[PDB]
């Protein structure tokens, strides 16, 4: 009866909802954002990731192509053709030196941008997973964390090319993971309608969150470092807290049927903007679930989002292969 | 672009944007096919006939200056629900069945039904194969096999008069029983958006490539005839 005891403790620790606490704050009336460019890849786009300099960005398409743009002057910098024609995720290093890619395959490729020659070449070919790679992120210029389709996560070591830690426990395949701001722990959501928290130091699961209707499509981490949000295919966006161990207020509307594909916060944590299948990227108040702003302009499914480090711009990409910098 | 460096930057960007035109020209004139099979089905023999924990394998074949990519998904997890979304632009799905086991058919029928009824995979034509005929004939004419026990309705069957065989009435009756069993699922639904093209292939038939070619052509033709309401 451990689950019953945990549920009873959670019920006892619950005192009030976020609506009652946040009713005493004046809401944000309306926010209007418009395009300021169209960064225009042959096939559909499956991922993107902002650089740390808040100027560059990298996009990956099903053609088997990675393109590194220049968000201010719209120019292109690098165009890398992959060895595999099916890629699902790409990651940009925090030091602006490497990029990583991985799709429906058992490989994570590492490309070294800065070389003595004016070309980019693959420097590490991380193999050892069994299922398709569904997420990959960097910790520093030496460690990379991947979440795969064989219901596992793996923390690697690029220098030696061998695994260092393996995270197991999920019954279904994991879709996306997000890293904590201090790069100590992280979170990862799977198709078993559960998101688990992992600690790098000992490589063991430390916390679980469950109670969501369907499989998890995307996950994002609160800027403070002690909360996170998830979006899934059940037309609901959920918020969870680490210390409280509770499922807090849910951002949902009665006129939405399709499923979320990507969720990202804002720099100040005041707005939660999430994409959808209905060609749109809706915006919600983080404390009242008030729909304040609809960002239309896409003619197909939205597959990626992202807010830059300093928060000036947010870039969205869809299945018609058109990246749009909103503002 | 007023500065000196920014002009070289924009010309480098343009030169980057003029190598994508060639890739688009190559990528438009190429037909993509998706291969599915089973464990005992001779998909490996077929893919060798046209021409390490990996997940996907590549095959290319060209007929009459027409190029076909043939994506064969390899060693993956048993559930195909989530990575099937990537394959909603392919021209056709080649599906492979071994009709020589007499028991490993019900699972094949449920797999075929799942492929047919997948809503991502709707409006995608399914080319279908049958492999290891000769084993089927050998097990049919050697006795000691209770085909009627496996399929109770097999006994009361009559070859459609449409048969065009080219030796044993019972063997052909069982063959067309299997063919019609596969065709029932496809004829149950569909609403005239995607079609199935059953065939009868030996272990290694050199004609096979041409076969696919013909089927592919037909599919595209029908698509055009519906885009114009001219069908």
């Amino acid at each position, epitope marked *: 009866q451990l689950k019953n005891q945990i549920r009873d403790a959670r019920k006892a620790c619950a005192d009030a909802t976020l609506s009652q606490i946040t009713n005493n704050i004046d809401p944000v009336g309306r926010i209007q954002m418009r395009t300021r460019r169209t960064l225009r890849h042959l096939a559909k786009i499956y991922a993107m990731h902002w650089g740390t300099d808040s*100027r*560059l960005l990298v996009s990956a398409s099903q053609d088997g192509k990675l393109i590194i743009w*220049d968000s201010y002057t719209t*120019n292109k*910098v690098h165009a890398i053709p992959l060895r595999s024609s099916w890629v699902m995720t790409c990651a940009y290093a925090p030091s*602006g030196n490497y990029v990583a890619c991985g799709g429906l395959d058992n490989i994570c490729s590492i490309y070294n941008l800065k070389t*003595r*020659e*004016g*070309n980019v070449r693959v420097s590490r070919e991380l193999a050892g997973h069994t299922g398709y790679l569904s997420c990959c992120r960097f910790l520093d210029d030496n460690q990379i964390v991947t979440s795969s389709g064989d219901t596992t996560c793996a923390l690697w070591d690029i220098e030696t090319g061998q695994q260092t830690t393996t995270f197991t426990g999920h019954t279904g395949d994991v879709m996306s993971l997000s890293l904590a701001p201090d790069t100590r722990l992280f979170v990862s959501g799977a198709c078993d309608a559960s998101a688990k928290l992992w600690d790098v130091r000992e490589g063991m699961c430390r916390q679980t969150f469950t109670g969501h209707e369907s499989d998890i499509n995307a996950i994002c981490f609160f800027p403070n470092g002690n909360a996170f949000a998830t979006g899934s295919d059940d037309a609901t966006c959920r918020l969870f807290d680490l210390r409280a161990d509770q499922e807090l207020m849910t951002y949902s509307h009665d006129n939405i049927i399709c499923g979320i594909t990507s969720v990202s916060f804002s720099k100040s944590g005041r707005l939660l903007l999430a994409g959808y299948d209905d060609f749109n990227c809706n915006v919600w108040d983080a404390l009242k679930a008030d729909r304040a702003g609809v960002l239309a302009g896409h003619d197909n499914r939205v597959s990626c989002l992202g807010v830059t480090d300093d928060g000036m711009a947010v870039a969205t990409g869809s299945w018609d292969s058109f990246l749009k910098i909103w503002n | 672009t*007023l*500065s*000196a*460096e*920014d*002009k*070289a*930057a924009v*010309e*480098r960007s343009k*030169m980057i944007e003029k190598q994508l035109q060639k890739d688009k020209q190559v990528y438009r004139a190429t037909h993509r096919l998706l291969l599915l099979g089973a464990d005992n089905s001779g998909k490996s023999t077929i893919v060798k006939q046209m021409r390490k924990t990996s997940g996907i394998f590549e095959t290319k074949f060209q007929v009459d200056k027409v190029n076909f990519h043939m994506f064969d998904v390899g060693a993956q997890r048993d559930e195909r629900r989530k990575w099937i979304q990537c394959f909603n632009d392919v021209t056709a799905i080649i599906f492979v069945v071994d009709s020589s086991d007499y028991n490993r058919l019900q699972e094949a029928l449920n797999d075929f039904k799942s492929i047919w009824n997948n809503r991502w995979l709707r409006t995608i034509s399914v080319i279908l194969f049958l492999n290891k005929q000769d084993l089927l004939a050998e097990k049919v004419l050697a006795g000691k096999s209770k085909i009627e026990d496996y399929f109770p309705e097999f006994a009361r069957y009559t070859t459609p008069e449409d048969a065009t065989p080219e030796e044993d009435p019972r063997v052909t009756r069982a063959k067309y029983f299997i063919r019609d069993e596969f065709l029932r699922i496809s004829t149950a639904s569909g609403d005239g958006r995607h079609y199935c093209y059953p065939h009868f292939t030996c272990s290694v038939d050199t004609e096979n490539a041409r076969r696919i070619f013909n089927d592919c052509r037909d599919i595209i033709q029908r698509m055009h005839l519906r885009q114009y309401e001219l069908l």
Partner: single-chain antibody
Amino acid sequence: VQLVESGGGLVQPGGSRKLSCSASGFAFSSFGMHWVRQAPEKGLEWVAYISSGSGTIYYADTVKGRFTISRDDPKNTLFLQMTSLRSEDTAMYYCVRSIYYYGSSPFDFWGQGTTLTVSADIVMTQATSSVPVTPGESVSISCRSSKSLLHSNGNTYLYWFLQRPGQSPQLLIYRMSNLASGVPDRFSGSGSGTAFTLTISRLEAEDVGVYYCMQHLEYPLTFGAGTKLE
């Protein structure tokens, strides 16, 4: 990575000569190329220019029809043809690579070089010509510009080269603040828009040489005079 240059020698006045710069060790087809001339008793001077795909070519104001530039990608060779040469074109020639994109490091690797014996542009000047130094003191070098080099975007296009007595020039600072790749982390540079300075904290026996000042804000690339250290 290395570049090998061939040609030169003794040429009678009015003749024609071909100089070849052979590149081996990088992607020659993704790099813009220049040619830099240094007189036996004077400083550096920019000669020509060619882009990656030969889409754009500039030329010096001193000579415009006497020099022809060409490139050969499959053999990776850069050709310079001179005809009707005068007595002034009797200096050292250097082959220079440069790649331009956001965050790049132009004018980094220089060739060995081959000998040869027979208006509205911004001018840049150096205050001193030779100063005495000691192994361990702090050194400051000043450069003066005739116009504000700071641009609308924010870049301050100025470069320091600091060649050595008997070797090819190197690169130290690009765009007035960014350090080079291999240089030790003790050089520094600063400026305000018209006057710039470069500071060396420590000092070793390898720092002896001539320090150069270059601008890259318009089509002409004008240099300084030089500052020898003893």
